[PDB]
Amino acid sequence: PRYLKGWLKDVVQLSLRRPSFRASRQRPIISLNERILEFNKRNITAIIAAYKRKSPSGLDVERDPIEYSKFMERYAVGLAIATEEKYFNGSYETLRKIASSVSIPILMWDFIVKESQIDDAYNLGADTVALIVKILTERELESLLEYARSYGMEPAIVINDENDLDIALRIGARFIEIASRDLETLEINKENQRKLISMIPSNVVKVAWQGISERNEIEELRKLGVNAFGIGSSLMRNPEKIKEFIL
């Protein structure tokens, strides 16, 4: 990985050593970035709803996985299921049980730093993973991108500044998540986020991720070209908010 500080260094080291398994997957690959483009055409706001009980940023919610996920299946373009145990209280079991209950695309949210993690996601029933430009070396990032695609996934490439953007573009990203929160500090910067989103090339599906609590931020962002919105904390706290986000 790259030089990492603080809780990122910790979780990355955790992820390098986490156990992988031998398996066979069930449900076929249901493309998320493709489903985002269908929703765009159907003029349904595309929301990637995350299920995560905890988060470094302070989220703290106890909610049933299956009931949450069945409810969201009715509205969301896809689900982001946290599988990182220490900082998100997720697990491989949580992804597995959810991927079996629902028939929409599922993004495994974790710190993907080795190839056996992508085998895990595939075997667990995930349809894609996120790969983080700040965490991976450029040649790790290119390789894992290609490794995910070899399975039939299109990874979401997570960026934060124009430099993450040059790297993600250079190594052939087509599906990009612009984070509003710095992964290290967890400081939000929507002004820097909006700048990046305006910049993204026409040929790339883009996602505005983190810090959305209102339907009217979704609107102003839509005028920028935003294809989908990664929302978790607000939905974990009040899942009826999804009705707000999509109207």
What DSSP letter does each residue of 70-131 carry, written as one string? HHHHTT-SEEEEE--HHHH---HHHHHHHHHH--S-EEEES---SHHHHHHHHHHT-SEEEE
Single-letter amino acid code for the residue at 18: R
At 109, which amino acid appears? W
Four-residue CA torsion sign, 103, 245, 47, 204: positive
| 194 CB-contact burial (10 Å; exposed 0-12 / middle 13-18 / buried 19+) | middle
Taking CA atoms, 176 is separated from 87, 149, 160, 202, in Å, by 23, 15, 10, 12
Task: Report which of 99, 85, 48, 72 is spatially closest to residue 210, judged by C-alpha positions.
Answer: 48
Q: Which domain holds residue 52?
A: 1-247
What backbone torsions phi and psi does residue 78 show, to the nearest 5 degrees? Answer: -170, 170
162: tokens are 């124009």
Are the beta carbons of 151 and 29 closer than 8 angstroms?
A: yes
Answer for the pair 108, 81: CB distance below 8 angstroms, yes or no. yes
- Closest C-alpha to 188, from 212, 224, 205: 212
Structure tokens at 74: 């009715």
Instruction: Say if residues 51 and 126 touch (Cβ distance below 8 Å).
Output: no
Pairwise CA distance, residues 75 & 7, whole Å: 33
Question: Residue 57 gets which letter from DSSP?
Answer: T
Tell me how far apart the terminal alpha carbons of the chain are, to the nearest angstrom: 41
Q: What angle do CA 31, 32, 33 make, to 5 degrees?
A: 100
Cα Dmax for the chain: 45
Phi, psi (deg, nearest 5) at residue 228? -145, 170
CATH number for the domain that contains residue 154: 3.20.20.70
Q: How far is CA 177 from the centre of its chain?
A: 7
CB 4 within 8 A of CB 135: yes
- At 230, which amino acid appears? G
Q: Please list the residues that pair with 214 across neighbouring strands.
A: none
Resolution in A: 1.5
d(C-alpha 1, C-alpha 3), whole Å: 7
Helix, strand, coil in percent for the chain, rounding step 5: 45, 15, 40
Q: What is the count of structural domains for the chain?
A: 1
Rounded to an integer, what distance in angstroms lies between the CA atom of residue 198 and that of residue 135?
24
